């Protein structure tokens, strides 16, 4: 079978980003030894090791949706993957408010329309507790 590839964006500190960029544009396999990525079983924490120097990482959710688009002639572009996550290196904490481009900053707060009426999972847990019970008493309340 075929499994859709999973692309994400890696953001590094600027000096380490310059060393990683120089090693990528060089093209040797020396970069392979220099750059490693260890993702912790939390799922939202990691180490990126640049030149064997550990950096602390967080995998965050991006507010917009990006899409990688490949081309052969630079006139027709084929969508290859959807990017929604970034492993910035240096829950509410795992949500990034800004977008990658310069015009998109504070997009989640300002350029996103918010419509409102985790919570569903809590309601399911409450229903399960009511089922495991015997007698349930309920009242919409006031200030108390």
């Amino acid at each position: 079978p075929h499994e859709l590839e999973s692309q994400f964006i890696l953001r590094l500190p600027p000096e380490y980003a310059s060393t990683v960029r120089r090693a990528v544009q060089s093209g040797h396999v020396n970069l392979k030894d220099r750059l490693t990525i260890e993702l912790h079983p939390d799922g939202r924490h990691g180490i990126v090791r640049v030149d064997r120097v550990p950096l602390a990482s967080k995998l965050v959710d991006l507010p917009c949706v990006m899409e990688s688009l490949k081309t052969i002639d630079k006139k027709t572009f084929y969508k290859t993957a959807d990017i929604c996550q970034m492993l910035v290196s240096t829950e509410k904490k795992f949500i990034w408010n800004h977008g990658i481009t310069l015009p998109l900053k504070n997009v989640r707060k300002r350029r996103f329309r918010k419509t409102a009426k985790d919570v569903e999972k809590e309601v399911k847990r409450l229903l399960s507790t009511d089922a495991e019970a015997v007698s349930t008493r309920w009242e919409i309340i006031a200030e108390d």
Partner: protein, 376 residues
């Protein structure tokens, strides 16, 4: 000795997706999306592997892929020059749609949930609309990507200024103004697969403005909606019959029940009633063999049954159904069936749209709202 065909009285006045996309192959075009997969629609989380090299916990080296990129580009140029030198069609396999080769750009979206959105494997074009200056003009400011076209009649809602070039994504689904920005100096692109991590740099990232929809998303329980569900199930059944190696072509029912688990089995048996029959005893027992008089449709007929853009419109409808369902009339107006109907009706000139409203995907004065207002 001349034309002599009164042609002015008789006659008074393109996107090629990949072969995995036009054949609706199941990684790229899913048969069924559950609730947690509809909430993560076009935002796929980073899954943990169970088997593979990355499934073992620990540090993992990323691998540079610049010999791979230039080897694949040189190989594709050899293929193109061996085929006569014209423009070629290359995306014929799923392994052509990897990010490991070709010139990648990124495309960011301004809206959170657009009315239409491309699946993986589908093609789009970049058109540079350039309105000439009044009288003399130097020529279109040249651009790295896309082809230039001179637009007297603005494609979008507004009109282009004289001497203004605007790039845009153009396909069958939408048309949307894009804006080229340079990448941040810190961000790279990591393509992870089961075997390891791979790293590219990116240099070009477009910002996609508010989409102008060219395809109408159907409503829930619509006639077009139920027709697409039935035709998608029929196409999947035909492609399972084509994949069958048995000389009387035969399929199993629980393959279809694995693909479409929300379907009642009466509908699946309705699709299998014509074109198949159930064998209970003897050979082919508990199989749905193909009827001997039934001609299984060819590949182009199956492609003419369902289009990929209809699948994208259906996925937009069911994702918006989930988001509305989770959030308990203003929200209903912002549903893509309403907004796509409003915009396409405004483009024929049926009705007008209030450009300031609640269907505004920004939530501020920027951006349009596609909801119908009477022309009076």
């Amino acid at each position: 000795p001349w034309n002599l065909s009164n042609d002015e009285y008789y006659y008074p006045k393109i996107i090629q997706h990949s072969i995995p996309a036009v054949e609706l192959r199941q990684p790229f075009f899913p048969t069924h999306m559950g609730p947690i997969k509809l909430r993560q629609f076009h935002r796929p989380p980073l899954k943990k592997y169970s088997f593979g090299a990355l499934s073992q916990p620990g540090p993992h080296s990323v691998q540079p892929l610049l010999k791979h990129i230039k080897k694949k580009a040189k190989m594709r140029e050899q293929e193109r020059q061996a085929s006569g030198g014209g423009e070629m069609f290359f995306m014929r396999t799923p392994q052509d749609l990897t990010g490991k080769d070709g010139d990648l750009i990124l495309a960011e979206y301004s809206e959170e949930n657009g009315p239409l959105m491309m699946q993986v494997g589908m093609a789009t074009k970049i058109k540079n609309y350039y309105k000439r200056k009044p009288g003399k003009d130097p020529g279109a400011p040249d651009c790295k990507y896309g082809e230039t076209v001179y637009c007297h009649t603005s494609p979008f809602l507004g009109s282009l200024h004289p001497g203004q070039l605007l790039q845009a994504f153009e396909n069958n689904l939408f048309r949307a103004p894009i804006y080229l920005h340079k990448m941040p100096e810190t961000d790279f692109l990591i393509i992870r697969t089961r075997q390891g991590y791979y790293i590219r740099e990116l240099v070009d990232i477009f910002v996609v403005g508010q989409q102008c929809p060219l395809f109408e998303v159907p409503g829930p329980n619509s006639k077009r909606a139920n027709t697409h569900i039935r035709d998608f199930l029929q196409v999947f059944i035909y492609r399972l019959f084509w994949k069958s190696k048995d000389r009387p072509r035969r399929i199993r029912m629980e393959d279809i029940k694995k693909a479409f688990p929300s379907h009642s089995e009466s509908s699946i048996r309705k699709r299998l009633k014509l074109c198949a029959d159930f064998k209970r005893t003897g050979m082919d027992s508990n199989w749905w063999v193909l009827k001997s008089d039934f001609r299984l449709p060819t590949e182009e007929e199956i492609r003419a049954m369902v289009s990929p853009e209809q699948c994208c419109a259906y996925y937009s409808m069911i994702a918006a159904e989930q988001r509305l369902k989770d959030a308990g009339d203003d929200e209903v107006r912002t549903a893509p069936w309403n907004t796509t109907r409003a915009f396409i009706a405004a483009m024929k000139g049926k009705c007008l749209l209030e450009v300031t409203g609640v269907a505004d995907p920004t939530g501020c004065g920027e951006g349009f709202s596609y909801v119908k207002i009477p022309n009076k």
